[PDB]
Subunit: 103 residues, 4 copies
Amino acid sequence: PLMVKVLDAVRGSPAINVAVHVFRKAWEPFASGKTSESGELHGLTTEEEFVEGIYKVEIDTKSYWKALGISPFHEHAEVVFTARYTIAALLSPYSYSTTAVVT
Amino acid sequence: PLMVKVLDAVRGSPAINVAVHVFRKAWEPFASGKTSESGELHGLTTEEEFVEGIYKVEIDTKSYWKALGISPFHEHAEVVFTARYTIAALLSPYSYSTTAVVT
Amino acid sequence: PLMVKVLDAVRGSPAINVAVHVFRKAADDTWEPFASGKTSESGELHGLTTEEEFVEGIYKVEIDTKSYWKALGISPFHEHAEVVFTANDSGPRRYTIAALLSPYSYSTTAVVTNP
Amino acid sequence: PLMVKVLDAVRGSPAINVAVHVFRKAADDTWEPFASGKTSESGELHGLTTEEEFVEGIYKVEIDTKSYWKALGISPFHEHAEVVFTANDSGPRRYTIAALLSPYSYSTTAVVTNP
Ligand SMILES: O=C(O)c1ccccc1Nc1ccccc1
Ligand SMILES: O=C(O)c1ccccc1Nc1ccccc1
Ligand SMILES: [Ca+2]
Ligand SMILES: [Ca+2]
Ligand SMILES: [Ca+2]
Ligand SMILES: [Ca+2]
């Protein structure tokens, strides 16, 4: 029901091994994981657990850029939303964009 | 070797049935098709045909928004690039962003 | 030292009268209110802070996208933006935070200048 | 009537001294040169055209991202942006075309005002 994908706009590649945390407004931690070699993170939650509510997806972009040797602006990339969801984040050192696609 | 994906940032959905044309700088038409129900367009070209060069991917966003009843700003969304490539476009009535991911 | 600019990708306009709240991370890792305001007719919010108030730390800029969309009769997926960054760590800088809004997406960038 | 603004998402700065070419679609469906210039220290390009020269039609704004990246020692995937739109069809408007640049991506939006 929820998938996160992270792309790197500087190197033109998936953003691999990026930590992603999901919170639900009571911020109860709700789910988390690290992106795969495809930049995707599957298996966050289950239908039973993902109820309507306000969620935040916080992507640890700072650790990502720091491991590449690039100084980043933001602490994170994110989307706070009211609730299949795909959340995608496109990363640059001084910018991000985040979208949701609900199918 | 080349895939195009188109997303709609207003309705939060894949952009379905969108015409996509690819050109190669001699603009020789090179490939084209329409996005599927997933917003994706597979099968554009072949390894043998997709040689290094300058390519333009032009997405007919105007026809897309007009069929939805929304007045759009642009004639198209696009990326002109020097050359697996995935080109993704995120559409709004007055904006687009386009990225490439090369894996 | 801190300017916020907000654009509307649905209407092709500045995002006018959008509420913007800035917070600073406190010692106890809570967010303490720092400064707030509304965008002007040009989409810009000037005068949030001063050089004397703008210390180093972790700042959060929250843009109230929900109210903006709702008031325009648009469905926001987006509750609010939360733009979070370390400021002034290596000395005073000027920051412009820009945000481009759509109902299911936003883009944000920073312009950092050394004054 | 036509302004272009360009930002750099790699460096967190305006994109300065970027070449911008504007073309207008001719009757034979070729692109005819219309106006061109370079961005300033603020990333802005003012003075492209005048109200008397800016007629209705299909315009293409090409931003030379390749040269900008190369000169900064960055690999551009991006050869150039091609931002294409119908202007002035229902009467004269003022347009701001903004572009946010990264090596493998760009975002663009329009601000349209009725003067
Ligand atoms: O959504 C995807 O599957 C995707 C695949 C390749 C490149 C970008 C992608 N997403 C997207 C593109 C532009 C802005 C924000 C997100
Ligand atoms: O339009 C501006 O004046 C502006 C100023 C500073 C930073 C970004 C800007 N616009 C913009 C923001 C995100 C995506 C595309 C365009
Ligand atoms: Ca409900
Ligand atoms: Ca070669
Ligand atoms: Ca310090
Ligand atoms: Ca007309």
